[PDB]
Design a protein around this ligand. Sequence first.
Ligand SMILES: Cc1cc2nc3c(=O)[nH]c(=O)nc-3n(C[C@H](O)[C@H](O)[C@H](O)COP(=O)(O)OP(=O)(O)OC[C@H]3O[C@@H](n4cnc5c(N)ncnc54)[C@H](O)[C@@H]3O)c2cc1C
Length: 453
Amino acid sequence: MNPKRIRALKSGKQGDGPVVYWMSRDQRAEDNWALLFSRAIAKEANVPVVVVFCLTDEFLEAGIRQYEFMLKGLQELEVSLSRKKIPSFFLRGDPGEKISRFVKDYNAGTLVTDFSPLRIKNQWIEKVISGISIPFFEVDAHNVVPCWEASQKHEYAAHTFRPKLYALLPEFLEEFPELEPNSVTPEVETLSDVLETGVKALLPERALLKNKDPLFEPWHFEPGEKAAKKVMESFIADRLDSYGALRNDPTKNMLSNLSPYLHFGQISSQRVVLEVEKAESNPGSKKAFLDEILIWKEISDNFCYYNPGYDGFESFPSWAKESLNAHRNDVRSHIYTLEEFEAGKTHDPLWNASQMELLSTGKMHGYTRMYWAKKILEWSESPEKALEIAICLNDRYELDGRDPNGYAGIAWSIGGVHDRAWGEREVTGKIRYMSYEGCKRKFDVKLYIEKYS
Ligand SMILES: Cc1cc2nc3c(=O)[nH]c(=O)nc-3n(C[C@H](O)[C@H](O)[C@H](O)COP(=O)(O)OP(=O)(O)OC[C@H]3O[C@@H](n4cnc5c(N)ncnc54)[C@H](O)[C@@H]3O)c2cc1C
């Protein structure tokens, strides 16, 4: 176990009770460094380990598609942890109040959590730190190389972060040790009831069409740690060989479809990389997929970790801020509202078809995500407005939304973060432009539009 994966958030006197793993980002029992580090500290203290998840008050800011995908995976996890003699406690409310109350009520000895560079997680950490007196650690269980170890600052381009991440791969890319069960079972409601009451509170804001029928189709991605592994094996056996050549074709289902499992932490990215590295396929197809799940995925954590305003105009590069400011007063060709974008009521059928795939499946194709966001910048009153619209629609309807990949992906499309300057156009400036005619020369746009009416 590498000690560089764990960082101390607060020092204190260790209690004599169970080590608490405050689970948040990585909701899985296998290949979890945070859960393994919690079990090792528990073994060294002759004390059991416990898992605590908090059902926050912010679930009403999303939809039913993410609330059901997350809770149905937690129901499977509670069984998996119970087979290892590990009990799971699911608290409802503010984690600044619940975690501090759970630590005091259960005489917690050490508190551990997984790493997340998002603002809402840092908000919880500040509230928990002020109300506990036991040691508090955090473990990077989402990235192969710890986010604070891959780079000590913000990397402005992928070609500057790639040699840093690959030079540390021989050290951190390793096999996971087996989770040891608790020696004996130690000494706040059923998830089925919390799922029922939460869905009932989310029903009025459910996405519906004119016939009062729901838009979301929940049969595209089955939640759970078991279904996540089956998707990973299917991608290696059937889709990995054709990933390098068809990853930019939305009419082909040649992607790994691992993002909803990677976001909620139902599968480990290090586990996927380990199986890809030992799989024999096209070298160009493996290089492209590892560049997305390692470089572009972990550089999104680096962007959110070293830029406090990662969701604001101030985090854009200086060349993009100067270019967008010089084109602020340029007359936009069209200006649509938030609901016009949300309902897919634009003049662009390719954009509307992209929005319909987001509304119906909760996972829009990777290539169309770049077109979908860049057109929001072209048809908004200001770059700040396009950021809010893109973040809203991405975090509301994407199953993998509310993730550092989304903010770093939106920042690349609108603010050119981790990009370079292109030909200067009006309105958009030097930001990389993506035209409708350019997409027709890349893939069958008529097939993608006809599929999502
Ligand atoms: C405007 C926009 C919004 C996005 N919204 C999200 C989002 O809400 N949530 C999210 O997790 N990703 C987002 N992305 C990144 C990317 O679109 C998705 O990760 C990708 O489509 C996920 O589907 P997949 O697993 O089938 O792709 P795959 O090609 O099979 O890639 C596998 C994994 O590599 C990672 N990856 C791939 N592409 C990227 C990328 N461009 N940036 C970072 N990581 C990547 C992902 O973790 C992905 O799961 C967004 C990108 C853009 C441009």
